Amino acid sequence: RDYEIQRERIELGRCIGEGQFGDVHQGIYMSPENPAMAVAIKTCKNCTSDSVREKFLQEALTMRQFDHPHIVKLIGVITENPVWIIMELCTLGELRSFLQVRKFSLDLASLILYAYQLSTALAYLESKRFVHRDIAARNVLVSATDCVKLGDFGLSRLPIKWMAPESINFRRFTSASDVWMFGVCMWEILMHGVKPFQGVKNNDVIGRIENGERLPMPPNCPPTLYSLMTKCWAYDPSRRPRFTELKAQLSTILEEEK
Ligand SMILES: CNC(=O)c1ccccc1Nc1nc(Nc2ccc(N3CCOCC3)cc2OC)ncc1Cl
């Protein structure tokens, strides 16, 4: 209904990042007779014009469209200077760091669960015909040890090493090129946050992909899950699974691994 929030309900905490328009903070949203809610706050640093303020706020209008357990929610906006966008906080931070730090504490079933949850968020977007374009582990947040979410779409935004050949060669971005990127995101997850094509130059990436090279099978990845990944990386977009297919398959693989 009304997304406008009184600034006095927000307590700005530490800086946790930055985007195009300004710093991102963690903070708190307070309301009478309720517990304080942890939030992320995107700020528009020195936005001293209507055109910049409008470009900033359109990122809120984008997030407002979505209602899914595995995509971060818009809580509200403050439309007086300085303009803030207030989002739900994923308290455990960025997935890549979480996987690196908690590696000897996480099992395969947990990694597969992260992939499944993300696939449900992306199937949801696919059903809305919304193309993400920026699917990578670095854009996934950790809400709890058993819960990951796509981060803010403004903050998520060329990522050559993640991109489908059709996106690199022809600038085509579709749900099918989303599927490719997700394949890479699943590889990152199984590798506990190692980046794809490490030590390889961006301009060389397409040469390798067109030569038929693909990211290798992670250690202790189930063959059935690597097979699903190689399907995501079919050179021909028409041959890749849809996110609807991915979610059903991942559901089966997860059950198998439990
Ligand atoms: C897609 N990426 C994002 O949306 C994003 C990127 C950088 C920083 C914040 C950020 N957005 C969020 N971030 C969070 N939670 C985070 C993210 C990063 C961190 N960090 C902790 C300090 O080191 C850097 C990253 C903390 C945190 O909550 C404590 N929750 C919700 C949103 Cl919408």
Residue ranges of the domains in the chain? 1-89, 90-258
Surface-to-core class of residue 257, CB atoms within 10 Å of its CB (0-12 exposed, 13-18 middle, 19+ buried) = middle
List, as own/partner pairs, every contact residues 29-35 make where C-beta atoms lie below 8 angstroms and the sequence separation is at least 24, other chains included: 29/5, 29/75, 29/86
Q: Which is nearest to 47 in space by CA: 72, 83, 18?
A: 83
Residue 82, preceding peptide bond in cis (omega within 30° of 0): yes
- Is 134 designated active site? yes
**Is 72 close to ligand 1, i.e. is its CB under 6 Å away?**
yes
Q: What is the largest CA-CA distance in the chain?
A: 62
**Is there a contact between 253 and 191 (Cβ–Cβ < 8 Å)?**
no
Helices and strands: H and E segment counts in the chain: 9, 7
The enclosing H or E element of 184 equals helix 175-190
**Is 156 close to ligand 1, i.e. is its CB under 6 Å away?**
yes
C-alpha span between 226 and 228 (Å, rounded): 5
CATH number of 1-89: 3.30.200.20
**How long, in residues, is the chain?**
258
Ligand 1 centroid, distance to 93 Cα (angstroms): 5
Contact residues for 186 (Cβ-Cβ < 8 A; gap 6+): 115, 225, 229, 232
Buried b (16+ CB within 10 A) or exposed e, 134-161: bbbbbbbbbbeeeebbbbbbbbbeebbb
Q: List the residue whose alpha carbon is closest to atom 17 of ligand 1.
A: 93
**Is 246 close to ligand 1, i.e. is its CB under 6 Å away?**
no
| Angle between the N-to-C axes of helices 175-190 and 243-257, in degrees from 0 to 180, rounded to the nearest 10 | 20
Name the CATH topology of 90-258. Answer: Transferase(Phosphotransferase); domain 1 (1.10.510)
Q: List the residue whose alpha carbon is closest to atom 27 of ligand 1.
A: 93
List, as own/partner pairs, every contact residues 203-207 make where C-beta atoms lie below 8 angstroms and the sequence separation is at least 24, other chains included: 203/160, 205/160, 205/161, 205/168, 206/160, 206/165, 206/168, 206/169
Residue 11: both structure tokens together = 């307590």
Instruction: Name the active-site residue from 107, 134, 152, 204.
Output: 134
Q: How far apart are the first and last CA of the chain?
A: 41
Buried b (16+ CB within 10 A) or exposed e, 217-237: bbeebbeebbebbebbbbeeb
Ligand 1 centroid, distance to 236 Cα (angstroms): 35
**Is 94 close to ligand 1, i.e. is its CB under 6 Å away?**
yes
Residue 228: both structure tokens together = 């699903």
Q: Give the resolution to one decimal, in Å.
A: 2.0
How far, in whole angstroms, is CA 237 from its chain's centroid? 21
**Could you give the strand order of the β-sheet that contains 74-78, starting from the edge strand earlier in sequence?**
10-18, 23-29, 37-43, 84-88, 74-78
